[model samples]
Target: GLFVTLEGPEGAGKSTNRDYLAERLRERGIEVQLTREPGGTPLAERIRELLLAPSDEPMAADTELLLMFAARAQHLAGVIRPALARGAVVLCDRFTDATYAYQGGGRGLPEARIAALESFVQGDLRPDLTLVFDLPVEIGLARAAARDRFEQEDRRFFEAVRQTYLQRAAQAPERYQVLDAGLPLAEVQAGLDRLLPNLLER
Candidate 1:
């Protein structure tokens, strides 16, 4: 049972390409379990709504961080753990890395705070592989310039988020595949196709 995660800032093509990757794996007879973080289970989705919904009272960074893990805990217990136990290949969109990027990097929270929550919520579990879609902050912003709380964040915030993601990937080179999302879709698909064979052999 392999756990794969897709991580990227908004408009990195993570959602579309993750679907393509899952479809390819399924075509090869892999039992793929597709899910997303801060979600997957019903309760977790409710929390996601709370976390994402626009509010007048600015959400505290600590509150935002805790809510994320709370949703994650339920998601893991209900969906992820069971699917993995049954020998399914879980393809999750985002995970702890997004928290490290958004909350820690974007919000100026300490990495140590995120690390502590990571330990408490996830224990020893970690993604076997993480595909990170890398692109320039301005480019990603241009691609995702829509009305959303997160999308409304300033360029500097996303720059910090991007840097954090890159730094983490660099730190654990063995676990991450940093892809240049600025490439054409076909090129990105080709890159993923190249990676899949090795991942399947694991």
Candidate 2:
């Protein structure tokens, strides 16, 4: 059983290609569990609404991180762990990496703080493979102009977020597949197609 996660900015085609990859896996008769972070549970969905819904008042950085982990705990207990126990390939849209990127890099929180919460909530569980879609911040922002509260941030915020994703991938090349998301959609899917065989063998 493999736990595969996808990481990228808002408009990096994570949702579309997550479905694409899951469909391909199912075509081969693989039991695939598709899910997303700040989601995957009833409680988690409420948390997601809180995290994403636009508002006049700003949220505290620590509050946001705590809410994220709270939803994650529920999602794991309710959906992710059970699916994995049944030998399904868990395809998560985002995971702790997004926390490190958004809260740590974008909001300037300390990585140590996030690391502590990650350990507390996740224990030793981590994705077996994580595919990170890489593209310029400006390009991604332009594509995601119709985003929610989180996406309403300015360019510098997303720039930091993008850099953090690349930096994390560079630090752990074996655990990641960083693709050039700036390419044509077909090319992006082609890159993922080539990686799928290797992941299936895992």
Candidate 3:
């Protein structure tokens, strides 16, 4: 079973492109299970709301991190692990990478803390492949809106988040592939098209 995930800051086209890619994979006769992080499970989705709620009250960094991992733990136990164990192709919209990028790097929290949370939530269960939708901070957010809650932050926050995502892809060169989302949709899909065959071979 191959577990593939898409990672990026909001407005990087992760949600839209995931649907397209899942369809293409199905056309090729591959069974794909499409879902999102901080979601895909009943309990996890409720936590997703708390994370994304738009209020005058700002959420603390540690609170955000705990909410993420809490949801993640539920997702892994409820959705991801079982699907993969069943030999299903899991096309997840996000995963541990987002926590490391947003909560750890973007928020300037300690990487050690994020690593510790990851260890407790999931051990030795890395994605087989992760596709990062690479785009500039200004470009992605402006093009996409209606962010759930957490994504409604100011430009500076998203910028920091973008930097963290790029850094993550840089650090995990082998596990990740950076695709230029600034390109046309078909072009971006073409890039993923090139990656799909190789990922499935595993």
Report lDDT per candidate: 0.90, 0.90, 0.83
| Residue 52 error, candidate 2, Å | 1.0
lDDT of 1 by residue, 1-202 (tens): 8899998875778888988998998888788999997889989999998888889999999999999999999988998889889888999998999999999999999999999999999999999999999999888988887515577789999999899899999999989999999999999999999998889987
lDDT of candidate 3? 0.83
**How well does each candidate superpose onto the true structure, as a TM-score?**
0.96, 0.96, 0.92
TM-score of candidate 3 to 2 decimals: 0.92
Question: Candidate 3 regions off by >4 Å?
Answer: 144-148
For candidate 1, the per-residue lDDT at 153 reads 84
What lDDT would candidate 2 get against the real structure? 0.90
Give residue 55's error in model 2 in angstroms.
2.4
Model 1 residue 105 distance off true place after TM-score fit, in angstroms: 0.6
**What local lDDT does model 3 show for residue 118?**
89
Ten consecutive residues with minimal summed lDDT in candidate 3? 144-153
lDDT of 3 by residue, 1-202 (tens): 6789898865667877888888877887677888898888888989988888776897888999999999988888898888888888899988888887778766889999999988888898888889888888778677657445655667877777777878888888888889888888889888888877777677
